[PDB]
Amino acid sequence: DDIQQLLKKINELTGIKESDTGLAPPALWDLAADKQTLQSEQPLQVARCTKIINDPKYIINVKQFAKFVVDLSDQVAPTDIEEGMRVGVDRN
Amino acid sequence: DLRNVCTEAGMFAIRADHDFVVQEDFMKAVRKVADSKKL
Amino acid sequence: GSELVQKYVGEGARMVRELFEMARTKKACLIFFDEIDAIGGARFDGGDNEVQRTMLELINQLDGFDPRGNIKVLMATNRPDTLDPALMRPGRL
Amino acid sequence: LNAKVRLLREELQLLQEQGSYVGEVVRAMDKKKVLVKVHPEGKFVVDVDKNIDINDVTPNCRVALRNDSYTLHKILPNKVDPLVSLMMVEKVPDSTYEMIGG
Amino acid sequence: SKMNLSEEVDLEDYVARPDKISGADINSICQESGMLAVRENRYIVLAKDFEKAYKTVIKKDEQEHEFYK
Amino acid sequence: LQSVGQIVGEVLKQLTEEKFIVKATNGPRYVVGCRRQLDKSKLKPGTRVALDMTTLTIMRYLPREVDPLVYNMSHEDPGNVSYSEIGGLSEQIRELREVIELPLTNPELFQRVGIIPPKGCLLYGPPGTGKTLLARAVASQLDCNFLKVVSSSIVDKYIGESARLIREMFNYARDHQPCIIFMDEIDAIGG
Amino acid sequence: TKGPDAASKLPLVTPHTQCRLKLLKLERIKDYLLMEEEFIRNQEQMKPKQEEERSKVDDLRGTPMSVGTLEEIIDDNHAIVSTSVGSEHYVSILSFVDKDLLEPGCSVLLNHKVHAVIGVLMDDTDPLVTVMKVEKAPQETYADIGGLDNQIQEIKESVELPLTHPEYYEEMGIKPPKGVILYGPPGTGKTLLAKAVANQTSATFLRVVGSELIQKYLGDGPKLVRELFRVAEEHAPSIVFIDEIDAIGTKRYDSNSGGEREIQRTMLELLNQLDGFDSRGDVKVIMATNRIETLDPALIRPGRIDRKIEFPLPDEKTKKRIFQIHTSRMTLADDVTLDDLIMAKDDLSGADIKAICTEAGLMALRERRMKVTNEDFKKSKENVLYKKTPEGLYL
Amino acid sequence: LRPGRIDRKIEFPPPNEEARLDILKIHSRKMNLTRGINLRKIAELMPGASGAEVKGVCTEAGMYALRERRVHVTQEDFEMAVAKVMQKDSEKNMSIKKLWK
Amino acid sequence: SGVDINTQQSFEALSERAVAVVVDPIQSVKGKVVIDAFRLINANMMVLGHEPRQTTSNLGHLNKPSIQALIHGLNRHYYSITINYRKNELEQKMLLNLHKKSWMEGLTLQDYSEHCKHNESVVKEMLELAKNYNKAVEEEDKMTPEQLAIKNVGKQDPKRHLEEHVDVLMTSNIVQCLAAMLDTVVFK
Amino acid sequence: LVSNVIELLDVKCAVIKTSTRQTYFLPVIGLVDAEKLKPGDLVGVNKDSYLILETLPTEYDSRVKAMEVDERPTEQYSDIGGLDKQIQELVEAIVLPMNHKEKFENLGIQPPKGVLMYGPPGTGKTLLARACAAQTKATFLKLAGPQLVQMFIGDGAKLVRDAFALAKEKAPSIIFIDELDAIGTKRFAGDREVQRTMLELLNQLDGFQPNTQVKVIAATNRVDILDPALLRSGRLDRKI
Amino acid sequence: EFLHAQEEVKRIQSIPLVIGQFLEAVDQNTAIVGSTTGSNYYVRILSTIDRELLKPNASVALHKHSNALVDVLPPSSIMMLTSDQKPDVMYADIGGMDIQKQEVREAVELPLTHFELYKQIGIDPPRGVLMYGPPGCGKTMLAKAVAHHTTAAFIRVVGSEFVQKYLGEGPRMVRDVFRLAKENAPAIIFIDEIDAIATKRFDAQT
Ligand SMILES: Nc1ncnc2c1ncn2[C@@H]1O[C@H](COP(=O)(O)OP(=O)(O)OP(=O)(O)O)[C@@H](O)[C@H]1O
Ligand SMILES: Nc1ncnc2c1ncn2[C@@H]1O[C@H](COP(=O)(O)OP(=O)(O)OP(=O)(O)O)[C@@H](O)[C@H]1O
Ligand SMILES: Nc1ncnc2c1ncn2[C@@H]1O[C@H](COP(=O)(O)OP(=O)(O)O)[C@@H](O)[C@H]1O
Ligand SMILES: Nc1ncnc2c1ncn2[C@@H]1O[C@H](COP(=O)(O)OP(=O)(O)O)[C@@H](O)[C@H]1O
Ligand SMILES: Nc1ncnc2c1ncn2[C@@H]1O[C@H](COP(=O)(O)OP(=O)(O)O)[C@@H](O)[C@H]1O
Ligand SMILES: [Mg+2]
Ligand SMILES: [Mg+2]
Ligand SMILES: [Mg+2]
């Protein structure tokens, strides 16, 4: 009985089996600028411009979320965006 | 059968500009349908 | 075959559609369906339904409107008697 | 009277805090991180509270996660299928051995 | 009891008949008697329509194909 | 512009005079209360209401939205189709009139004689020879709703269609002018 | 690589009888356990760099970390990940992430707020599969099996000898049998042999029942089978024990029901994993059934099941061996001749021989005796066996 | 049914005369039996009965007293209950009975 | 939020003490009014000095910042300012009129029908509760009585469902009788 | 936020179902005119106020636009052998009422609304459909049954609605729903979604003004599977 | 201050509450509730709620924001014959079934009202009645009369209702009916035309 108890105690004391995660070698990243891109770059929901409206307006399908009528930001030009292609949109 | 033969006589009349259906046309329609129903 | 059979409704037919689209983008694609009897079972009347819908999607992709293109399909099964006659038709197989 | 009033006040305060999420544990990943599955949001790698020992966070246990950080803060009773839960006798039948003859 | 009936109808005449008929058959007999009385634009049920309804409901053999018996 | 939308829900139950149970169409169920100057009797179980989006209080009631299944079970046809349209069935229309007119016109004699129910009826014959027009010929007098629920939605093999598929016939007929459930070809019910 | 995850077990104690040598062996095992406990307890306490890097990575990651699926890789530092709700986000890939293992379909780790990829969930095993893995090996060894020498030899040459001595197979030019089925009457030693195999094997052992392979939802059955075989492949030397294969291995037929066709689909996925496109790998499959004639021919065909090991009802010698094994712990009498019970007509199975011993012990307890006798054994036999035969036709 | 799964098969044969008497005394313990109650004769009057039928006999003997609006049961009530509960259904057609000689 | 920080910066441009107030009208649905005053923390001061706020007294540490604000950035980019309500007379006596209970309700006799029904209902439920109290007292099980005194606490029979109902009945009856005597004296 | 007006009711008030699958009542219409609105129109409401800000032009899904025939496959009727009666029926029920119309009204004969080509596989159903697309100037609108089956609730009904609307926009438009068995199964939770798609198809078939300029062709190898409510009298009748 | 605290306790339940399902109580002052928004929550129970109403699965009202359980909502299913759904067949409407009437009543109406006589004799009144005979003799009419004349919940099912497709749904419906009768007891279950599922059990091979 006490051998069983010791086995359980050893297992509970170690009990980690550290799960591997995609962590690069320390020399590979060594970047404090990861915080810079985390704060500066914003995530963008992907959506396909179903219909173009002619300041042009754009109807976007955010997969299952919803349909919105949006406009491009100043970064991209109207020529780049075409009907039916998937584009990234900010969450706000 | 009567409704369909009425429609089928007109359907016969679609060929050529016939805006009216003749007695021969009704006869063709019935001798078509009443025999086609057997199949 | 497991991927073509998806939990959600309409997803297997969608997967078949994207698979055939991807084959069409390439030149002279070769598609292999091993154990086609997993999804190519004969229709009946809910049963599979969704699996039958996926099989119908594959059927109309193989033959029908919108010619398939340079896509030679390959199918293998040890129980061909359970296949849908539409799928076994000599325009698809 | 002071005890009564204080008890009511702490009940109010503990009622104002939000309800914590309920999630099953896929597996414990670290000595301080657990891979849980919150329904229906999905799977999360959550941190453990200081009052919960990681060694009691066994796979497939129902842990409680705080409303904000999804922090594992209670071990909770395990999940039983509702149809299987009614199978356990809670009120024993009144038949006794002396009621069986022959 | 709920039916209008008539003075001339005597239910004991129909009760004493040897025919073996269930309570559903009794209800059907009475309903057919009412229907027969109503068909002739009569608000009273008499012996004749009750008798005809009895005879109609009693006939239950239908075909039986004449050789099973 | 200042106006804001209001969520749409059904009053499932009446908790108290000032407490209601409402289910949002694609939301959760909320316990809510009425606004104030609303006739609480209009809020039966099943009615459509417009909850406020912030306090969730019932603000106004709404007509029901026409349901799917009910397209041939609720449509009314108070038309006048003469018996000349359905030709060659004078005896059958006479018999149909003798069956339907007498109970509909004067049920007082029927309750006087005692026999209440005249239900039943049966029009077996060749298929598609004018069975529907027979009940459409009788539509000369009244018979407004005139539902057609052929071989479906009343039995479904064992019981499957019942209550909500056995009683709504009699509800939507009663809340309107007389009609004919007219179930059809019952030889193919559940098959 | 991710080598085999062999089940842990303590060294076996030989004396069995409660003598002093057994006590000494158990005390030695306890002493080593105490030494290990003391060492791994004084390690962290006696212990008084990378902390800065770990802290920086943890603050950058934040908590909680959502688990999503990587859909596409656009740039070296940008990707489209789909959250568990099905909505895809165009997120940024942080530097402290391996771009090598970042592949489409993998389970990525995302920031809760920004959703940037901050790690990859490596294991991500279905919890319904990780339960199948054997962690505590059963205590039944090959010494617990009476007779079945040919069956033991075949099962060893199939699952144990290839791992222990692959040189014979390499020199011979033959690939060792990668599939075996154990069939026979119930209570003969199929599950016993599988338990002994798991006890002796150094490979990872996965045990299923063939009824947990069936899932309520449509695609979850074949997906579960694929996940199980992927896990078996991850730990290169693996043994998969599918007990009661009759549950899903039943012969394929045209069925007008979604459930039966889905179960046939699950079996088809099983036998596509067994032998189909792509090699199966160093995964050996053991299947058990009481009714092999009801199994689909494609499932038990050579290439999937290479050795159809038969498990007949024990004969006189095997019955004697099973009685010797199952009466070893019992304090037997002197007048007890087991040969009278060993004779039988034709239908004493190994499971029955153990119930006979248990019932004999119970009858001894009834008479307040801890030493079973012959009358106890005959009463136990005529008490425990339940039967079901031709009449006096043949001469 | 193999040993290891069902180790012991315990059979419940229909109660014998003494077993039936025991069941009768068990299910008539709360009943106000008259002085001339001989429960053994009731056991003999129930050959090849089951425990449920023995209890049904007591129940029907009590229901006879209920019908007569009394709280005590007599031997006659038990005897009539024996007949009412243990009433079997036979072939009813001597044609079928006489197929087998 | 970030935009809130930007507009607060725009406001501080005019005056260094431009305070922002955030109000939650749905969270402040009851006697709790959830309001807060925020001003930005100069991120340069975060390293140039330490904390932005001197603690020269104990008047600022009597509050406890809410976890939502710390998650959203309290004490890292904005700092809370304690909320003080400047309420005075002629602004408090006016708000006591929203429920003022004009003199009529102080002399209304209710109605005797539902008063009698309420009295009867409370008396019946009190008879049942007195049966329960009688049981609870005669049981007097002495197997560690201090423990049965704590194993049966459920807001039940002994005292809570007890005289509290006596309190309600006595208060209602006394008030009704006193009002009846008052109106039979004052009115003719 | 794009939304649809599921109904319009007098107090001037509208019930809007947003693209987020939730319906809100609007105490006021918004910035547009209630008269220039009806059930089913696409309107861009506010994200949070949910108030209509402007009306939106008829928007067709990418799948619906891809459904239109642009390559115009070349298959003469000479390539079809053994089906002369069937070709004549199809051309006289789907093409002849199209480019003639007014004279069909002149005889006062109702041209059937839809055609169901049914038979054993390989009999030439889809071949005849492709030939009809070849030798007609109408805007062919091909599709399949499995296409109108999607995960999201109401997506199949929306798909068939946009298909029929695009068919309406082009005056000479033909809809070919190949492999009708996928959605035409007998009435029996993806079953609910498939049923919603089927009833939406029935509603679109019934909503046609009689002898309109849009004809529907459907093909099926299994008719016993097909729901009997599909055939009926106003819907597909010519079971070729 | 105590009065103010009681008022706040009352104000905790102040109308806009989300209905939730009670899954299981972790311990006193705490429970796991399933909000009808679709996600499970670990919440705190107000002490003022009477604990015996927390059934293993009962409809409870949750605070809109804190999600805490603050109230328990009060509870036709398959038939559950309602007061307005009574068959309205009186015993007088039945013509001359005195033996059958008395035998049926002594088992299905007397125990519910006059249980004292059964206790005095101590006989465990009969729980099951089988009415049989030629069709149209008045069995279902007598069951209707019992339904109209009883103070207990009446459940009316047909033996053919139990025979369904989707194996495990027939016995599921049988168990549902009996559990429904258990919940609101006393109750009467009438299984008409049970002869469908009543045949002598033989060695079924399909
Ligand atoms: N040859 C044998 N030698 C020793 N013990 C045996 C032998 N055969 C069976 N037994 C005993 O019988 C018990 C039950 O048998 P086992 O678990 O092997 O069944 P099985 O062959 O898998 O059949 P089933 O799956 O139908 O139960 C084992 O635990 C073991 O103790
Ligand atoms: N009557 C016919 N005359 C000429 N070619 C034919 C005929 N019937 C079929 N074919 C040819 O045989 C093939 C049959 O495919 P088709 O698309 O016509 O099938 P279908 O009748 O629509 O059936 P399914 O939907 O089951 O595939 C085609 O390649 C077509 O050219
Ligand atoms: N004794 C009776 N008194 C009055 N009506 C009866 C009697 N017996 C039968 N009926 C009538 O016969 C019909 C058949 O009764 P019911 O019990 O439903 O059929 P079954 O006996 O086959 O179950 C009932 O509608 C009832 O009105
Ligand atoms: N005698 C008739 N006179 C006029 N129209 C008829 C006649 N018989 C059949 N019809 C036609 O048949 C159709 C009705 O068929 P119906 O008899 O209702 O079929 P079913 O009985 O299968 O429902 C109507 O459209 C009608 O035009
Ligand atoms: N040996 C017995 N002694 C006393 N009462 C018995 C005995 N056997 C049966 N009974 C009575 O008869 C009834 C038998 O029902 P039950 O034992 O549930 O049937 P089964 O054995 O077929 O499951 C019980 O209510 C019990 O009170
Ligand atoms: Mg086994
Ligand atoms: Mg085709
Ligand atoms: Mg009946």
Ligand SMILES: [Zn+2]
């Ligand atoms: Zn803000």
